[PDB]
């Protein structure tokens, strides 16, 4: 029963098509709960889960103002980064940031996070000590020096240990009937012949939350890691997730294979076979 709060910032320049777009979304575990888009007709931080709606106007005003400010600061940061890499004003670039806090079952801070990426590649990250930085290159070393001068690590540590955890605990209580509820997978095994020689056994997991899940095929109790096709866990659109794992088996040998399912919502891990 550990939990996390994470914010995801994306800023993207588009020369000739206006000023860089700024997007911010917030999550608790795998549940999105706020969003902001600087391209909206009237940009505001807006609710995306029922349990956040109860927050009062001073909350929504604070989060809107921070995000409107960030829209401008991320435009400055994108100009700076273009300079740091001697890039032309003609090209499009992306700046991403993700930060947040993890807590354990007792609500104590397990560790905090703040990382930044430029055009998809790691740029600067706050170290686990919440007091030092790891810069990817000599461009990020400029950012690090700026941030050391402004004592940013100090402020991050205070946020990550203080309000980040306190508001996450508050969200966890306000949304407890969903945020603190693990829904187990609905499972089954399907059989798809390929030829007279082989067939596919596919193990399905549906409707589960949170997304963390382990789905493995075994042949005589040995794992088929290199032989299993795992699809990426995907959202159903109703808060829950889906996944499948498949293995090609020699026809007639289907009963040597077991599918194994681990999920927090499950009282016990499951073992499944094809049932013709």
């Amino acid at each position: 029963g550990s939990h996390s709060m994470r914010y995801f910032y994306t800023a993207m320049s588009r020369p000739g098509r206006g000023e860089p777009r700024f997007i911010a979304v917030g999550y608790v575990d795998d549940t999105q709960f706020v969003r902001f888009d600087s391209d909206a007709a009237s940009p505001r931080m807006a609710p995306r889960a029922p349990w956040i709606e109860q927050e009062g106007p001073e909350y929504w005003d604070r989060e809107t103002q921070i995000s409107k400010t960030n829209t401008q600061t991320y435009r400055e940061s994108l100009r700076n980064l273009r300079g740091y890499y001697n890039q032309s004003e003609a090209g499009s670039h992306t700046l991403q940031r993700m930060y947040g806090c993890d807590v354990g079952p007792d609500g104590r801070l397990l560790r905090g996070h703040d990382q930044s990426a430029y055009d998809g590649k790691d740029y600067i990250a706050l170290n686990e000590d919440l007091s030092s930085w790891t810069a990817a290159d000599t461009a990020a070393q400029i950012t690090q020096r700026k941030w050391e001068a402004a004592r940013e690590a100090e402020q991050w540590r205070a946020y990550l240990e203080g309000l980040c955890v306190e508001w996450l605990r508050r969200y966890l209580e306000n949304g407890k009937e969903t945020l603190q509820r693990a829904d187990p997978p609905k499972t089954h095994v399907t059989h798809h012949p390929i030829s007279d020689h082989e067939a596919t056994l596919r193990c399905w997991a549906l409707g589960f939350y949170p997304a963390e899940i382990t789905l493995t095929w075994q042949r005589d109790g040995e794992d088929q890691t290199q032989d299993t096709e795992l699809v990426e866990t995907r959202p159903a659109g109703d808060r829950t997730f889906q996944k499948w794992a498949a293995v090609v088996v020699p026809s007639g040998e289907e009963q040597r294979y077991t599918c194994h399912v681990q999920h927090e919502g499950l009282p016990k891990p499951l073992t499944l076979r094809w049932e013709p």
Binding site: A24, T73, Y123, A150, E152, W167
Partner: peptide, 9 residues
């Protein structure tokens, strides 16, 4: 609850 707006990169 967002982190306060901070310094540009």
């Amino acid at each position: 609850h967002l982190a306060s707006s901070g310094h540009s990169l």
